[PDB]
Structure 1
Amino acid sequence: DVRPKITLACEVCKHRNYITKKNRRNDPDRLEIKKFCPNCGTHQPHKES
């Protein structure tokens, strides 16, 4: 629970394509990292879902 498994979804494709873990008492908000969306074929800003 302290580090729940979270999925990241492309903000332009909306294809949840990355799952990772993240602390909740360190960043109690969403995580925005620029991963690679394979559908589009380009680094897009993914967002915590």
Structure 2
Amino acid sequence: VKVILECTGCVRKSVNKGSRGVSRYITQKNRHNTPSRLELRKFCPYCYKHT
């Protein structure tokens, strides 16, 4: 089916240095849910970027 879908982090609406939600374009997920370790979020080390 090849659904396009966004990965997203953990939201954390805060007053840090540009702290905001980070979503990333990704594809192929017609399977079990795959959190990949896409990183360099607004918080600079990151893991398990969900959906």
TM range (shorter): 0.5 to 0.7
Q: Whose radius of gyration is greater, 1 or 2?
A: 2
Q: Which runs of 5+ in 2 are unaligned?
A: 13-19
Count of aligned positions: 44
Give me the identity figure in percent: 5
Q: Which runs of 5+ in 1 are unaligned?
A: none
- Supply the RMSD in Å over aligned alpha carbons: 2.1
- TM-score in terms of structure 2 length: 0.64
Q: Which has the higher strand share?
A: 1
Structure 1 runs (4+) greater than 2 angstroms displaced: 11-14
- TM-score in terms of structure 1 length: 0.65
